[PDB]
Design a binder for these strands. Structure first.
Ligand code: MG
Ligand code: MG
Length: 132
RNA sequence: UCGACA
DNA sequence: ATGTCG
Protein backbone atom coordinates (compact mmCIF):
# COMPACT_ATOMS: atom_id res chain seq x y z
CA UNK A 1 0.00 0.00 0.00
CA UNK A 2 2.75 2.56 0.97
CA UNK A 3 5.02 3.12 -2.04
CA UNK A 4 8.35 3.07 -0.24
CA UNK A 5 10.33 3.86 -3.40
CA UNK A 6 9.27 7.55 -3.24
CA UNK A 7 10.20 11.07 -2.19
CA UNK A 8 8.22 12.58 0.73
CA UNK A 9 7.95 16.33 1.17
CA UNK A 10 6.67 18.53 3.99
CA UNK A 11 6.56 22.08 5.19
CA UNK A 12 7.71 23.44 8.59
CA UNK A 13 6.76 26.83 9.93
CA UNK A 14 6.90 29.30 12.79
CA UNK A 15 3.65 31.13 12.56
CA UNK A 16 1.15 30.79 9.73
CA UNK A 17 1.69 33.17 8.05
CA UNK A 18 5.21 33.05 9.31
CA UNK A 19 8.69 31.74 8.68
CA UNK A 20 8.37 28.78 6.21
CA UNK A 21 10.81 26.04 5.24
CA UNK A 22 10.36 22.71 3.51
CA UNK A 23 12.29 19.53 2.89
CA UNK A 24 12.28 16.41 0.81
CA UNK A 25 13.27 12.94 2.18
CA UNK A 26 13.70 9.43 0.89
CA UNK A 27 10.53 7.67 2.15
CA UNK A 28 12.45 4.38 2.72
CA UNK A 29 15.55 5.62 4.49
CA UNK A 30 14.48 8.96 5.82
CA UNK A 31 17.57 10.55 4.27
CA UNK A 32 17.19 14.32 3.73
CA UNK A 33 17.62 15.05 0.04
CA UNK A 34 16.85 18.74 0.01
CA UNK A 35 15.92 21.40 2.53
CA UNK A 36 15.08 24.96 1.60
CA UNK A 37 16.51 27.84 3.64
CA UNK A 38 13.76 29.49 5.77
CA UNK A 39 11.62 32.02 3.90
CA UNK A 40 10.80 34.89 6.32
CA UNK A 41 7.10 35.11 5.56
CA UNK A 42 4.74 32.68 3.87
CA UNK A 43 1.77 30.38 4.37
CA UNK A 44 1.66 26.68 5.14
CA UNK A 45 -0.01 25.91 1.86
CA UNK A 46 2.49 27.96 -0.13
CA UNK A 47 5.27 25.99 1.44
CA UNK A 48 3.56 22.66 0.85
CA UNK A 49 3.20 23.68 -2.84
CA UNK A 50 6.81 24.83 -3.21
CA UNK A 51 7.94 21.56 -1.61
CA UNK A 52 6.08 19.48 -4.23
CA UNK A 53 7.34 21.49 -7.10
CA UNK A 54 10.90 21.43 -5.73
CA UNK A 55 10.52 17.63 -5.57
CA UNK A 56 9.31 17.43 -9.18
CA UNK A 57 12.37 19.46 -10.23
CA UNK A 58 14.74 17.42 -8.07
CA UNK A 59 13.47 14.14 -9.52
CA UNK A 60 13.33 15.41 -13.11
CA UNK A 61 16.92 16.71 -12.97
CA UNK A 62 17.99 13.22 -11.74
CA UNK A 63 16.00 11.19 -14.26
CA UNK A 64 14.00 9.58 -11.47
CA UNK A 65 10.50 8.19 -11.87
CA UNK A 66 9.80 7.98 -8.13
CA UNK A 67 6.45 9.32 -6.95
CA UNK A 68 6.14 12.18 -4.50
CA UNK A 69 4.10 11.97 -1.32
CA UNK A 70 2.60 15.09 0.20
CA UNK A 71 -0.01 15.21 3.00
CA UNK A 72 -1.41 18.50 1.65
CA UNK A 73 -4.69 18.21 -0.29
CA UNK A 74 -4.36 21.95 -1.08
CA UNK A 75 -0.92 21.74 -2.51
CA UNK A 76 -1.67 18.64 -4.51
CA UNK A 77 -4.54 20.49 -6.11
CA UNK A 78 -2.51 23.60 -6.75
CA UNK A 79 0.21 21.58 -8.46
CA UNK A 80 -2.39 19.79 -10.61
CA UNK A 81 -3.89 23.16 -11.59
CA UNK A 82 -0.42 24.76 -12.06
CA UNK A 83 -1.76 27.53 -9.92
CA UNK A 84 -1.24 28.47 -6.27
CA UNK A 85 -4.49 30.13 -5.07
CA UNK A 86 -3.01 31.76 -1.94
CA UNK A 87 -4.75 34.64 -0.04
CA UNK A 88 -1.48 35.91 1.38
CA UNK A 89 -1.16 39.71 1.18
CA UNK A 90 1.38 41.07 -1.29
CA UNK A 91 3.86 43.54 0.27
CA UNK A 92 7.62 43.89 0.66
CA UNK A 93 7.68 41.16 3.40
CA UNK A 94 5.76 38.59 1.23
CA UNK A 95 7.51 39.51 -2.06
CA UNK A 96 10.05 36.66 -1.74
CA UNK A 97 7.54 33.85 -1.31
CA UNK A 98 5.26 35.27 -3.94
CA UNK A 99 8.27 35.39 -6.41
CA UNK A 100 9.06 31.75 -5.55
CA UNK A 101 5.47 30.72 -6.12
CA UNK A 102 5.32 32.58 -9.43
CA UNK A 103 8.59 30.82 -10.51
CA UNK A 104 7.21 27.43 -9.44
CA UNK A 105 4.07 27.88 -11.51
CA UNK A 106 6.34 28.95 -14.37
CA UNK A 107 8.39 25.77 -14.07
CA UNK A 108 5.19 23.69 -14.19
CA UNK A 109 4.11 25.51 -17.37
CA UNK A 110 7.46 24.90 -19.11
CA UNK A 111 8.20 21.23 -18.21
CA UNK A 112 6.65 17.84 -18.40
CA UNK A 113 6.78 15.21 -15.79
CA UNK A 114 5.18 11.85 -15.27
CA UNK A 115 5.79 11.90 -11.47
CA UNK A 116 2.73 10.65 -9.67
CA UNK A 117 1.87 13.06 -6.84
CA UNK A 118 0.34 11.00 -4.11
CA UNK A 119 -1.56 11.81 -0.96
CA UNK A 120 0.16 10.52 2.14
CA UNK A 121 -2.55 8.80 4.22
CA UNK A 122 -1.76 10.18 7.66
CA UNK A 123 -4.86 8.69 9.26
CA UNK A 124 -3.70 5.17 8.35
CA UNK A 125 0.10 5.50 8.26
CA UNK A 126 1.02 8.16 10.74
CA UNK A 127 3.01 11.33 10.11
CA UNK A 128 4.59 11.74 6.70
CA UNK A 129 8.32 10.88 6.83
CA UNK A 130 9.42 14.47 6.01
CA UNK A 131 7.53 15.92 9.01
CA UNK A 132 9.27 18.43 11.19
C1' U B 1 -24.52 25.20 8.25
C1' C B 2 -20.54 22.21 8.12
C1' G B 3 -16.96 18.37 6.68
C1' A B 4 -11.89 17.56 5.46
C1' C B 5 -6.52 18.27 4.61
C1' A B 6 -2.72 20.78 6.73
C1' DA C 1 -5.29 30.67 16.37
C1' DT C 2 -4.54 30.48 10.45
C1' DG C 3 -4.42 28.60 5.55
C1' DT C 4 -7.03 26.20 2.15
C1' DC C 5 -10.59 22.76 -0.51
C1' DG C 6 -15.06 19.80 -0.85
MG1 MG D 1 2.32 18.52 5.65
MG1 MG E 1 2.88 17.42 8.13
Amino acid sequence: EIIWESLSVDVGSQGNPGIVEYKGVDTKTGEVLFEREPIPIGTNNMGEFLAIVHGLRYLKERNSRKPIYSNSQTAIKWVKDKKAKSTLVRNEETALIWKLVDEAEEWLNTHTYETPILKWQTDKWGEIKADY
